[PDB]
């Protein structure tokens, strides 16, 4: 078929920057290209068609371009509204095919994570398994490493992260990391610590507990 590879695939900038997304097509698709914005948990919306025509009700700042098999979407100055993911679509050949997306975020000044740790509850221990939850709150950028050391030991595939989208009045992400053990395993050891690394905190922080 036609592969439509969006180049940048993720990119940071601030309200008023001039961003450009690109999308290269496997072969000549003429100008049969559309561009789409999708906000999280919400259905994709149509921005540009025929590669260069602005859809009705779309801000002037969005612009489509074409150079043979290469297509660009530029935004001349980001607004608070239009922080989302963007796909290109060729529609010159069944099967029409999209791209992988390009996430655009706020690119604020760095902010450290409010890092915590939560032991498991009495309610959950009576159930036969133990989850212990480390929380990273209100930080930028999104990148962050978390390591669970139970008795200063590497988490051997027993943890799981999860993270929101950044957008808020303060432009920051948050992230939880959940280590899940069976009560049998949990009660053996005593030292449950969570080490966090982030480019807003020099010396890697470690919260712990014993219960």
């Amino acid at each position: 078929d036609i592969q439509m590879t969006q180049s940048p695939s993720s990119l940071s900038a601030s309200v008023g920057d001039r961003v450009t997304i690109t999308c290269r097509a496997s072969q000549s698709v003429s100008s049969a290209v559309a561009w789409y914005q999708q906000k999280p948990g919400k259905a994709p919306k149509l921005l540009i068609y025929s590669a260069s025509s602005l859809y009705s009700g779309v801000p002037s700042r969005f612009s489509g371009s074409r150079s043979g098999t290469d297509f660009t979407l530029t935004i001349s100055s980001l607004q608070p509204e239009d922080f989302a993911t963007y796909y290109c679509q060729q529609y010159k050949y069944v099967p029409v095919t999209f791209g992988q997306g390009t996430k655009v975020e706020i690119k604020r000044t760095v902010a450290a994570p409010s890092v915590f740790i939560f032991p498991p509850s009495d309610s959950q221990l009576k159930s036969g398994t133990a989850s212990v939850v480390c929380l990273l709150n209100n930080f930028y950028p999104r990148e962050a490493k978390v390591q669970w050391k139970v008795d200063n030991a590497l988490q051997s595939g027993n943890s799981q992260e999860s993270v929101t989208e950044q957008d808020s009045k303060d432009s920051t992400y948050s992230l939880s990391s959940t280590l899940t053990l069976s009560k049998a395993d949990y009660e053996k050891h005593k030292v449950y610590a969570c080490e966090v690394t982030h480019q807003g905190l020099s010396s890697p922080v470690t919260k712990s507990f014993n219960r």
């Binding site: 309610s123 959950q124 709150n137 507990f209």
Partner: peptide, 20 residues
């Protein structure tokens, strides 16, 4: 099966304590 995350000394920072 919902479970609590009790606020603690290991969850309080600069006047802010996180519950969950």
């Amino acid at each position: 099966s919902v479970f609590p995350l009790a606020p603690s000394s290991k969850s309080t920072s600069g006047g802010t304590a996180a519950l969950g």
